[model samples]
Target: GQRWELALGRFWDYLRWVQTLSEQVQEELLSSQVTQELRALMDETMKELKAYKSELEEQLSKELQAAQARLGADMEDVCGRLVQYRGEVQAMLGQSTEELRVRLASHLRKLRKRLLRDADDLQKRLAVYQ
Candidate 1:
């Protein structure tokens, strides 16, 4: 795999920003060799970018952790509900709904088998975590 290809796109993007910065620097540098206002503006802008960079990184880290935590919570709830469904299916053993007793019977069979497999997989994963 050529990871270098991915770098090429970002490199072009970086060059654009660099070009803009270079142009701005040249214009400011030429305006006056020692302009107090231009120097102050550049210094203040750099400080703001530096501070925002840290805040952005911290916020992204918190969001990533929250997403993973929510996934774990969802998995637990789904597995618990699946366990209850299994009990219901077992108790109904070959029974059917009032209207489509014959028509939907095969569909129920398929659903039961799939749910059982899913339930078993959930138990295995929960055990491994424990």
Candidate 2:
């Protein structure tokens, strides 16, 4: 808001400087005609800029909320899968044995790799919005 205020101040200052130039031009030569046109153009431009700024402000919050919700959903999905996998592993395994240990270790390693890859992907996607 402070920056916008400063920008608007500068815009008005420019308009004032343009107005000052009219005094240097002869009234008979219709110098005021060009100044009038320039002022009109600047007024129109200021209106468009204000409209654009309001539109952007309105959209910014909605877009940020949507992105945050998507990230939350993705986090929940990965965690849920991990929980299910843990349950499945526990139920499928019998009494502790050498063969079972080897298979369990391999499965856990694969799960770790998958989780790491997913986390990396999510981080990259998040960086785009941030």
Candidate 3:
């Protein structure tokens, strides 16, 4: 949560910074009425803005990587458990009666529902840009 906040904060900072620079340029234009000077200043600000954006992008990328790394082990463990569970369930299915099979299938559907929910949650979490 903190990382997400920080990312967005940095982005806001960059935007506000650009806004300030733009306002200053507008003032320069109002006073000078020189198209060349205004264009030059705008070009310079664009370069500086790109640099600022790049820094934020780099920091955000690192934060995202760190977050994913933190979850890697847990993800692996869950995947392992799921694999083992499926193997066991498949083995059981071969020897089970019709009623047992139906019950197990129902349970499997529940598991699938849980898996889909988990997958969607992960996707949503990953979609945050800032």
Candidate 4:
């Protein structure tokens, strides 16, 4: 595109010359044998660029949809695995809390019984001193 624009810039002097001419002379010059062909060539270049732009837009749209589908599948799989792990952790914690409560209650019962027996022995020895 840049090369084509640069090539057309070579005719800058010709454009400046036409701009300085009267409207009738400018119209005649533009419709002359050479400039008419240049106009047609520019029209053809425009048509080719429009077709190429359409193809590029369609190709990019298809690629975007495919990428979105692949990413969605990957994210869904990750979310499912995380949910499963969360459930497993919750179940393990629930069981551990119940087990710890039962073990602590059993230990406290034994401790209470020992304290009562020691207190009874101390009372009997003190009665002998009295």
Question: Each model's TM-score?
Answer: 0.25, 0.30, 0.29, 0.26
Residue runs of model 3 more than 4 Å from their true location after superposition:
1-96
What would the per-residue lDDT of candidate 2 be over residues 12-117, giving only the tens digit for each residue? 4543343232333223113344344434444443445345444555654454445434433433433343344334546765454344335544554554454345
Model 2 scores a TM of: 0.30
42-80 per-residue lDDT for model 3 (tens digits) = 344334433543555676456554444433333333333
- Error at 111, model 1, angstroms: 0.9
What would the TM-score be for candidate 4 when compared with the true structure? 0.26
RMSD of 3: 23.9
Cα displacement (angstroms), candidate 4, residue 27, comes to 98
- For candidate 4, lDDT tens digit of each residue in 51-76? 43344456534434343333233323
lDDT by candidate, in order shown: 0.36, 0.41, 0.40, 0.38
Sorted on TM-score, highest at the top, how do the candidates line up? 2, 3, 4, 1
- Residue pairs clashing in model 2 are none
CA lDDT for candidate 1:
0.36
Better lDDT candidate (2, 3): 2
What local lDDT score does residue 10 receive in model 1, on the 0 to 100 scale? 35
The digit string of per-residue lDDT tens for model 1 on 1-130 reads 1222233223323323322324353344334331333233333433443343345456534443343344334333322333333345456765742333232333434444543454344334333433
Count backbone overlaps in model 2.
Answer: 0
Candidate 1 has a TM-score of 0.25
lDDT of 1 at 59: 55
lDDT score, residue 81, model 1? 34
What is the Å distance of residue 46 in model 4 from its true position? 99
